[PDB]
Structures are given as C-alpha cells and as structure tokens.
Homo-oligomer: A and B are copies of this chain.
Amino acid sequence: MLGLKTSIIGRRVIYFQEITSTNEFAKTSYLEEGTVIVADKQTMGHGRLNRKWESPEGGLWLSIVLSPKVPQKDLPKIVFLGAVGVVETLKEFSIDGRIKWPNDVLVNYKKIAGVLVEGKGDKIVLGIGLNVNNKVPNGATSMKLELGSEVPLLSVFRSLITNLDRLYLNFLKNPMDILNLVRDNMILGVRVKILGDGSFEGIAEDIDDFGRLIIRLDSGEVKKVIYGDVSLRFL
C-alpha cells in the first residue's frame, strides 16, 4: 500500500511499533536483499560499539539488508552511502547536513544522524538513525529543531529510501562514485582530533581513494585514518 518504486532498497519493508534494535533484527533474521526494517522506537538502539542510541518516537530508525556483489575492496564504502543518502534527504527539506567522517551527519556541528554498518560474510546491514520530530540528547539536533516545525515522518522515509536505492544501484556499477559525493558533502579544511590508540591533531584535508581521512599534522606529517575503532573530534 506504500507504492514504493525503488529497484532494490524497499522491495520489502518490515515496520514495528517497537523493537529492540532494527540493526540486530536485520543481522539476526533471514531477510532478502533490499528489505528495510523500521520502527517507531527502539528500546535497545545502539551506535558504534554498544553505546546507546536514543530512539524515541518521532525519529527515523531503520536498517537495510544489502548483499553487494562489488569487489571486497569497495565494501568499506557502504557507510558513506548512508551518510550521503541522509544529506541528500536533508537538502530536499532545505536543511544543511554535512558529513563528519566517517559516519555522522551534522547541522551546525550538532549531530542529526548516525550511520552504523555491520557485516557478517556477504550479508551487510546498513543502519541509519535520523532525528526528525523526536526529543534529542545534548550535542544533537533534529529536522524539527532546525526547521522550526514538524516534518511528516513518512515523507522523510520515502525521500531517504528513494535516495538510497539510487545511490546503491550506482554503487554497484561505479563503486568509486560515492567518494566524490562524500568529499562534496564532508566537513574538511578544519582542525580535528583523532581518537583511537592514542590521539593526534591536524587539518582534515580530504578522503583518499579508499575513503581514508587524510590528516596533515602541524609538522607536515600526513596520516591516513582508516575506518575502524577510531573517533573524530572537532576543535
């Protein structure tokens, strides 16, 4: 009854009034590629590790099952598909979303969305949490807060699914294309602090051909940060 016209993402949609976590349900259940798991609220939503992701009613909490047939070397770029998809949807609603490498979307440096990709073999789960009309924690913002008025959640869902399907289809044929879109929508040219096994500061210059964040330290040393157990902090 939703009348989705996408090719892969959105072929099927499983909606829940409440769920523990759409990413967990998607990882655990036997699902077809393109199936979207979405819930009004999550009781055990999580980000990066197992850090809690606030998922109250009013936001868009979903996960997408993917089985990309592209080269193994390209797989790490799925998180960017989610971030760019969110940015494109935000621009459709006239909200200035910008990507904070590697998985966050900010509006005036406040976190409006987070992307979490989890994989086990050939099955990849793309999770996206976007604050729409819900209350948010400190350090965050929402579409409603930025626009000053409520936004139809279903409209945001339709927009995002349409964008993700297009991005995913093109990723299958041109896996390098997404990097261009990321660079064009990412926060760069500013000082950042990279937190991981230790920490260092420098200018976030760009992302390379593998999506690694290129940082120029003050002494001129160039470091390449790869996606993993590393966080980014703006100064």
Contacts and interface: CB of A to CB of B under 8 A. Distances in A.
A12 interface: yes
A53 interface: no
Interface stretch (A2-10, A76-84, A213-221): A2-10
A1 B154 CA distance: 6
A12 B19 CA distance: 10
Stoichiometry, copies per complex: 2
A33 to B, nearest CB: 13
A38 interface: yes
Interface residues of A, number: 25
Contact of A60 (B1, B13, B16): B1
A190 interface: no
A11 B3 contact: no
Interface of A: 1-6, 10-18, 38-40, 57, 60, 62, 153-154, 156-157
